[PDB]
């Protein structure tokens, strides 16, 4: 039943129906199939050549957006006496709700990830320094630097990108790097051979670590530096759509839920209340 759809389907004119043994409007929800009643069979229709496009809902476009996945502020200064001029971030797409919810509309996803890094500075006035930063990709669980001036930043094999605050945001693509044919947006299991591991966390789905430091030595005064990382999935393939998240997220480590204090989206009632089932909200007066 696979076919190429580029526009919404057309409508054909229909006439009066009075056929015994034919009841297109009746269905059996129990079969699990969605009703197949066509407009032409429910009412009398006219012919309509529908030219409405369907490209903006292509999965590639739906998920094809650079969404914020990480925001980190730290102090750039003399740390003689906390993120000391650098930080390490275990990449994940569970911290910011907008991206998280969209990705979670699918069970499995295969995509390459375009990473964009935006840097901002503020004095703690005599001007803003045009600093050089280094973002080093370190595999999940692998050895990360522990100091701004660590020799580990020599990045002999790890990929590192050096960029200035005055340059456009840095950008690079991390390929689909899962050990499987697709990432598991959801994982009903324990990724360990013992029974004490974390539930729902399959490290195979953790792209990796992003170690970011300011290359410049500290200045005589302190600054607040904020690094924002954006991710845009591309060359996407998606499988098994899922029920959208309704309850507010509680943790990046699980699907735990509590609900809002009052509707909407309270554990007790997802939709806001109306006086009764015969009360029409926004009724035209």
């Amino acid at each position: 039943v696979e076919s190429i759809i580029k526009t919404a389907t057309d409508t054909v004119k229909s006439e009066i129906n009075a056929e015994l043994g034919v009841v297109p409007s009746l269905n059996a929800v129990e079969t699990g199939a969605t009703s197949n009643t066509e407009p032409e069979e429910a009412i009398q229709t006219r012919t309509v050549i529908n030219q409405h496009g369907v490209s903006e809902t292509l999965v590639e476009n739906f998920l094809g957006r650079a969404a914020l996945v990480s925001k980190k502020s730290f102090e750039y200064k003399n740390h003689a006496s906390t993120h000391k001029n650098f930080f390490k971030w275990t990449i994940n797409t569970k911290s910011f709700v907008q991206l998280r919810r969209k990705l979670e509309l699918f069970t499995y996803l295969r995509f390459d990830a375009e990473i964009t890094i935006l840097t901002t500075v503020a004095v703690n006035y005599m001007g803003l320094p045009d600093l050089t930063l280094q973002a080093m990709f370190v595999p999940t669980g692998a050895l990360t630097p522990k100091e701004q001036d660590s020799f580990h930043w020599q990045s002999g094999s790890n990929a590192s990108v050096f960029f200035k605050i005055s340059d456009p945001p840095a950008r690079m693509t991390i390929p689909f790097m899962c050990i499987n044919s697709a990432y598991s947006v959801f994982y009903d299991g324990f990724a360990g051979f013992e029974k004490n591991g974390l539930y729902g966390i399959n490290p195979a789905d953790t792209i990796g670590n992003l170690c970011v430091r300011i290359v410049n030595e500290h200045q005589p005064v302190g600054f607040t530096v904020t690094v924002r990382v954006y991710m845009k999935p591309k060359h996407i393939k998606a499988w098994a759509p899922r029920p959208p998240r309704t309850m507010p997220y509680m943790s990046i480590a699980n699907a735990n839920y509590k609900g809002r204090d009052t509707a909407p989206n309270t554990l007790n009632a997802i939709i806001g209340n109306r006086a009764s089932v015969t009360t029409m909200p926004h009724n035209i007066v």
Partner: protein, 237 residues
């Protein structure tokens, strides 16, 4: 014609005289692992009839205040029959599943059960940041129950659960639901004791009710693995 059905696998057979057609998850059918998708290089064992047969789990009672039940696969069967033995002696397994949920009552009873097969149903815990523990997830043959079926115990919703392979058992219409499940995973095979591909959920969206004589109305689940394959033979765990 699409109300009667007989399922026969191995030495087991099941008939229903009030079916509602039957569901083939995502329009697929189970099959053995082809050479162009294989990873493990050892010759697999394909037991066929000793494992690809119906296993009936203990029944549950549908009560006026029931919230719903669930069984995870292959966990629910990892300790049953020859399927269980192969699972215990092999590091890797692969298979589809033929699911048949049964529930009959009276022409004076009403109630509607959503019978849905959820892929990767990762449960969430309620009102806490602590993730669910091993014993909260691995229930085995007994299966578990829903705490908040309204949100599928995962913060989403049962209202949109129809996006997953499913059928319904509406007492006035049918007395059974059948769903054929193909292998569903991102890997060609997996370790059966730590990951569940599918979760069978049976939830009463419309409660059981009647004004006739009260009787215990059970719900029974029969599951038949399909096209079983096992790799990585060793001792039993």
């Amino acid at each position: 014609s699409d109300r009667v059905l007989q399922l026969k696998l191995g030495n087991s057979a099941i008939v229903t005289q009030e079916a509602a057609n039957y569901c083939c998850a995502y329009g697929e059918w189970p099959n053995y692992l082809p050479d162009h998708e294989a990873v493990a290089i050892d010759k697999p064992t394909q037991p066929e009839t000793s494992t690809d047969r119906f296993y009936t789990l203990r029944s549950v009672k549908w009560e006026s205040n029931s919230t719903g039940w669930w069984w995870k696969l292959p966990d629910a069967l990892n300790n049953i029959g020859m399927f269980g033995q192969n699972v215990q002696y092999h590091y890797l397994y692969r298979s589809g599943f033929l699911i048949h949920v049964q529930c009959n009552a009276t022409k004076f009873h009403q109630g509607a059960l959503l019978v849905v097969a959820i892929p990767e149903h990762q449960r969430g815990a309620h009102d806490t940041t602590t993730s669910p523990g091993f014993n909260d997830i691995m229930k085995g043959e007994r299966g578990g129950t829903f705490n908040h079926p309204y949100v599928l115990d995962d913060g989403t919703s049962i209202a949109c659960a129809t996006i997953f392979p499913h059928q319904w058992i509406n007492l006035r219409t049918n007395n059974s639901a059948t769903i054929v499940l193909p292998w569903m995973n991102v890997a060609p095979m997996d370790f059966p004791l730590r990951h569940n591909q599918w979760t069978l959920a049976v939830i009463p969206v419309v409660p059981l009710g009647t004004r006739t004589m009260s009787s215990v109305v059970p719900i029974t689940v029969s599951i038949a693995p399909m096209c079983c394959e096992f790799n990585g033979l060793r001792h039993a765990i």
